[PDB]
Amino acid sequence: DVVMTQSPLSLPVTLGQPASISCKSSQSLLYTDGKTYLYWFLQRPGQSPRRLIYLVSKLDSGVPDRFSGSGSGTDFTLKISRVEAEDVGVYYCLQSTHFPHTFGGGTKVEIKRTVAAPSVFIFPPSDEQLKSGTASVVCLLNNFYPREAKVQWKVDNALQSGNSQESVTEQDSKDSTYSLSSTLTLSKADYEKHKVYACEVTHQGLSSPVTKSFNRGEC
């Protein structure tokens, strides 16, 4: 099978600056009809890949001219002359000259924007969940940049370990930020035995760690 190698795996780029993605095939993609069946797609989070380019350099309908494709034989390139906030996502190349058709491993384009401190929010468990014997506490870090953020859970100032999980959204296509949600899960008994619930946030946009807390049973 034809191996499709994409380079780089991750592409951080400053807004308005050019980006170049390489796609290399283990065999020539030139078919017997004189055409080169090389395509480029963009895939956004939780969405299907969308075609940008076909036949090496042909742009699909609605694709702006900042996008271009070039190459021949085994070496191909996708270029973005001036990267925009909406260009973030995973780019994939594909060959269909040979059977089976094969895709490149993908290149994630990221916007390098100015540092943005996260807005930190905390949510107590609901009475509905408390009735079931479990208590989930949620900490939200909203619209921050860069992606690196440290969340620490504290229950009556005691650092928590092995009872929390978190996930991060993909980079926003409009403001180029990330958001993070972290859930602390305790039994109702442990929850009712403690008073202060805090989430401690460390990020580049913060001069010192920010602690967002609530006292159980304030209202």
């Binding site: 099978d1 299907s48 089976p100 509905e128 969940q129 989930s136 949600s181 609530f214």
Partner: protein
């Protein structure tokens, strides 16, 4: 101006047969071809096979003759079947179509379906519990308040979350789900709104878990402090 609609997500037991359908609308002046592609969670894309205009097929040999693509009775409807499944077959499956001008001139992969997640598991489906993430002064930043819903203890993925039946979209963040040690998923969906709107506007999260036929609407009421 072409639309591809795929059948719903759900479970397939290991060793059993995965079955999906795709309906291709919008081709009128030419015939078309339908390619099938899959994407394991957090991985790349793998081509499965193709069904040509006349009904003949081409399959990826990596699928070891476990695959079948057929034309259904209903106009523009196609079925993909994959036999003897294992955890390696858990993926988002897509159908993709393109114009076929002649055997010597055809496009490929021009228009894609939304993708359907098929999970290979011997476990039963489980609908989620939906809990409010109540706004309070602990979630209220200078004129703006954050609120949400915690969609907990469901299986398999995915779940869809909307706010106010889709009328509320600005400031919404729906997070990737996490897999707990119980083997059940937990997801949160949050929204930032003007805090002055909290006493005059009702906020409801609409949760749909297609694999278990579960639909939950939860009103998110503010705390007093």
């Amino acid at each position: 101006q072409v639309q591809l609609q795929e059948s719903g997500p759900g479970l397939v037991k290991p060793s059993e047969t995965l079955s999906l359908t795709c309906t291709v609308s919008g081709f009128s002046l030419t015939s078309y071809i339908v390619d099938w592609i899959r994407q394991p969670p957090g991985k790349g894309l793998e081509w499965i096979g193709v069904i040509w205009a006349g009904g003949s097929t081409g399959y990826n040999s990596a699928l070891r003759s476990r695959v079948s693509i057929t034309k259904d009775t209903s106009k523009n409807q196609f079925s993909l079947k994959l036999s003897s499944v294992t955890a390696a077959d858990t993926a988002v499956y897509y159908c993709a179509s393109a114009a076929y001008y002649s055997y010597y001139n055809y496009d490929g992969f021009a228009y894609w379906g939304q993708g359907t997640l098929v999970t290979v598991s011997s476990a039963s489906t489980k609908g989620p519990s939906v809990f409010p993430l109540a706004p309070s002064s602990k979630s209220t930043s200078g004129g703006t308040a954050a609120l949400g819903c915690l969609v907990k203890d469901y299986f398999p993925e995915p779940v869809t979350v909307s706010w106010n039946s889709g009328a509320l979209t600005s400031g919404v963040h729906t997070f990737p789900a996490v897999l707990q040690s119980s083997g059940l998923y937990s997801l949160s969906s949050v929204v930032t709104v003007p805090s002055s709107s909290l006493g005059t506007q009702t906020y409801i999260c609409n949760v749909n878990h297609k694999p278990s036929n579960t639909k939950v609407d939860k009103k998110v009421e503010p705390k007093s402090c």
